[PDB]
Amino acid sequence: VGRRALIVLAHSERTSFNYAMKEAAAAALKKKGWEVVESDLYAMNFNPIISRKDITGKLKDPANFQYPAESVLAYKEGHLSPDIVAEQKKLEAADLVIFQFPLQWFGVPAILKGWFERVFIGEFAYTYAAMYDKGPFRSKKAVLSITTGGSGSMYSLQGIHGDMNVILWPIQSGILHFCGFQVLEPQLTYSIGHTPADARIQILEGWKKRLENIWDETPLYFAPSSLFDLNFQAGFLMKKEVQDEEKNKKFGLSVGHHLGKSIPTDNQIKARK
Amino acid sequence: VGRRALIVLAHSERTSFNYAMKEAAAAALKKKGWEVVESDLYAMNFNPIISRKDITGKLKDPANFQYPAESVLAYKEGHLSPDIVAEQKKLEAADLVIFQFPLQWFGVPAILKGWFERVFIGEFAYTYAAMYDKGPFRSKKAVLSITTGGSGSMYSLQGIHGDMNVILWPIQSGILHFCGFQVLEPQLTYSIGHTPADARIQILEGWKKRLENIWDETPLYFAPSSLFDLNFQAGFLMKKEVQDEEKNKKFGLSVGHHLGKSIPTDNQIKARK
Ligand SMILES: Cc1cc2nc3c(=O)[nH]c(=O)nc-3n(C[C@H](O)[C@H](O)[C@H](O)COP(=O)(O)OP(=O)(O)OC[C@H]3O[C@@H](n4cnc5c(N)ncnc54)[C@H](O)[C@@H]3O)c2cc1C
Ligand SMILES: Cc1cccc(C(=O)Nc2ccc(NC(=O)c3ccc([N+](=O)[O-])o3)cc2)c1
């Protein structure tokens, strides 16, 4: 159990179900003796774009600009934009991280996809040496909590919207696990434009119950980077003895590591593997 | 063949490979007698956030705000924000649509993920009746062209980054096909931070070759919405006779329609199915 957390609301409104879920998250963690940092994004009319004005001091190369390179430099010295630096020390503090938001266009709203870019800078958040489960934030846990337009049958394995494990891999593995996070199961509060008034409290209640023993959960299964060739000459492929083990096995490992086989369904939604 | 197009650069720089790819796209289409609209996003320091100030006139409900509902209303009358309306008539004009950008955090940069939200409004872009291949933009074609941090072996089926078909479903199906677009194959220009100076011309050349007979291509396979239960009582599931046809078949249909089976690999990258 850890003494700290971070919540990130990503909806304009303070009337929304997302706000209520955040205030429900707040009151829940506050009730267990956790510190609850809040990066209410829309409230702090946050910057979502990457111009060259993230870096404070002189540009090392102001002719052609690799933002990748010029950002990494700016961190280690200590002259980035301090609205990035402010948000960074919350993460160094916070053991848990909760992202509350709506699914609009099969992904996270624009204002969080700018948060991810500007804050998660190389060395700080990710390295191309310290990757995935070896990554900086490996001693942390992270959770998603989404508010969907369609129903839960639409995003089934055979709904028109297709699988939901598929829409969570880009995020839960590609961002959170890539930095280090032991990604816990997400909270899929579907079709909220239909739900009754009382069932928009049952959801808010089941959330608070869940948040009690949240650190003591077991996270989702991602093929650990102990199973891979971490050098860029072989091609960063999966280790060659482990390839033969899975050719007698029926499923994949993750969604992205389907291996052209069965997807162990609810890989990104349930944890028991 | 159509007499129009639209390109959307989503990188700050005009030195970038993305800019060169856009200028290469521009000169290519201009050479074939196509009109080339350009929404150079960073140049038009574009708005990526959704506040309530997209709608011009009075808010129908300024107590609790569904942006979904208040946006749809605002379109059909004709008093949205005109920087949205300006971008919209380009789409009504443009037959083809090219998205040039970098893959940062397993997806599209923040400034395009705001473009998608504010411009693709209900009735205009998508409907919950006219869905997918029946959708508004069904008489149009759309393409992606990406610039990646890692190499092409990393995003193989057994690389640490996992599949690339998996990272393209959220976008190519969940955005473009959902509106209508017959999504043509994407342009995966990998690891550009390593590439030699001359091979950063071979790529720019092969692009221009490809753009000549681009409309005469055959698009990617997405399970058409003729195969689905388009009413929200059964649950928007796949039609019940078609379910039995695929239980004797070995592969899935799409990535999201894996059906817990093999993924017909390069579903989102090659077209022959
Ligand atoms: C916060 C952050 C997170 C990231 N996360 C990931 C991740 O999770 N996974 C991942 O794989 N990558 C990641 N990346 C890396 C990202 O993919 C790279 O930024 C991008 O792929 C590299 O292209 P670029 O547009 O940034 O570079 P460019 O600015 O396009 O550099 C390309 C070079 O080609 C030159 N060039 C070639 N031809 C021409 C021409 N005709 N005219 C002019 N110049 C030319 C340019 O001058 C330049 O030097 C991340 C980057 C950042 C900043
Ligand atoms: C009752 C109430 C009040 C205020 C606020 C709220 C709320 O959070 N609404 C809400 C409900 C749903 C979404 N997501 C979508 O609408 C949506 C758009 C496009 C897609 N898509 O194509 O997958 O899904 C966003 C906000 C609900």
The angle formed by the CA atoms of residues A267, B187 and B204, to the nearest 5 degrees, is 150
Closest C-alpha among A139, A136, A142 to residue A214: A142
Mutate to test the interface with B, among A166, A238, A249 (most CBs of B within 10 A): A166
Nearest to A48 by CA among A125, A118, A95: A118
Q: How far is CA A269 from CA A199, A265, B216, in A?
A: 22, 8, 41
CA distance B57 to B80: 8
Spatial CA neighbour of B13 closest among A68, A111, A52, A70: A52
- Spell out which residues of chain B touch residue A119, defining contact as CB-CB under 8 Å: none
Place of tokens 């929200």: B232
Cα atoms found within 13 Å of the Cα of residue A225, Cβ hemisphere only: 20
Please indicate if the annotation marks B200 as binding a ligand: yes
Query: Residue A99 burial by CB count (10 A; 0-12/13-18/19+): exposed, middle or buried?
Result: buried
- Spacing, Cα A66 to ligand 1 middle (Å): 6
Q: Is B149 a catalytic residue?
A: yes
Taking a C-beta distance cutoff of 8 angstroms, is the pair B241, B232 a contact? no
A104 CA distance to ligand 2 centroid (A)? Answer: 7
Report the distance separating Cα B203 and Cα A213, nearest Å: 52
C-alpha–C-alpha distance, residues B159 and A236, integer Å: 6
For chain B, give the number of residues: 273
B155 labeled part of a ligand binding site:
yes
**Cα–Cα distance measured from residue B89 to residue B72, given in angstroms and rounded to the nearest whole number:** 16
CATH class as words, domain B1-273: alpha beta
Distance between CA atoms of residues B205 and A258, nearest Å: 34
How many C-alpha atoms does B189 have within 13 Å on its Cβ side? Answer: 24
Q: Are A25 and A19 in contact (CB under 8 A)?
A: no
Nearest to residue A26, comparing CAs of A42, A39, A12?
Answer: A39
A161 among known catalytic residues? yes
Pairing of strands A187-189, A141-147: parallel
Domain boundaries, chain B: 1-273
CB atoms within 10 A of CB A231: 8
Residue with tokens 């069904």: B138
Let me know if B198 is exposed, middle or buried by CB neighbors in 10 A (0-12, 13-18, 19+).
exposed
Query: Could you write out the DSSP letters of every residue in chain A?
Result: --S--EEEE--S-SSSHHHHHHHHHHHHHHTTT---EE--TTTTT------GGGB-S--S-SSS--HHHHHHHHHHHT-B-HHHHHHHHHHHH-SEEEEEEE--SSS--HHHHHHHHHHS-BTTTB-SSS-GGGSTTTT-EEEEEEE-SS-TTTTSTTBTT--SHHHHHHHIIIIIIHHT-EEPPPEEE--TTT--SSHHHHHHHHHHHHHHT-TTS-------GGGB--STTTTSBB-TTHHHHTTSSSB-SSSTT-TTSB--SSTTT----
For residue B38, the cross-strand partners are B7
Q: How far is B34 from chain A (nearest CA, A)?
A: 29
**Quick one: tokens of B56?**
């011009």
Determine which one of A149, A159, A162, A256 is catalytic.
A149
**Rg (Cα) of chain A, in Å, rounded?**
20
The finding on whether B68 has its CB within 6 A of some atom of ligand 2 is: yes
Residue A221 Rama label (left phi>0; alpha psi -120 to 50; beta): beta
Ligand 1, residues at Cβ distance < 6 Å: A 64, 66-68, 71, 117, 120-121, 178; B 11, 13, 15-18, 20, 102-106, 147-150, 192-193, 200, 204
DSSP lists the bridge partners of residue B142 as B97, B183
Nearest to A177, CA basis, from A267, A260, A103: A267
Concatenated DSSP letters for chain B?
A: --S--EEEE--S-SSSHHHHHHHHHHHHHHTTT---EE--TTTTT------GGGB-S--S-SSS--HHHHHHHHHHHT-B-HHHHHHHHHHHH-SEEEEEEE--SSS--HHHHHHHHHHS-BTTTB-SSS-GGGSTTTT-EEEEEEE-SS-TTTTSTTBTT--SHHHHHHHIIIIIIHHT-EEPPPEEE--TTT--SSHHHHHHHHHHHHTTT-TTS-------GGGB--STTTTSBB-HHHHHHTTSSSB-SSSTT-TTSB--SSTTT----
Report the distance separating Cα B265 and Cα A265, nearest Å: 18
Residues in CB range of A199: below 8 A, 6 or more apart: none
Cβ atoms of residues A149 and A191 within 8 Å: yes
Q: Which of B50, B66, B120 to mutate to test the pocket of ligand 2 (most atoms within 8 A of CB)?
A: B66
CA-nearest of A265, A268, A270, A229 to A250 is: A265
Cα–Cα distance for residue pair B84/B56, rounded to 1 Å: 11
**Which of chain B's residues have a Cβ under 8 Å away from the Cβ of A183?**
none
Q: Is the separation of the CB atoms in A259 and A271 below 8 Å?
A: no
Evaluate whether B90 touches B37 at the Cβ level (below 8 Å): yes
Q: Are A188 and A146 in contact (CB under 8 A)?
A: yes
Residues of B in contact with A132 (CB under 8 A): 160
CA distance A103 to A168: 11
User: Which of B158, B259, B87, B238 lies closest to A253, judged by CA?
Assistant: B158
Of the candidates B273, B252, B247, the residue with the CA atom closest to the CA atom of residue B262: B252
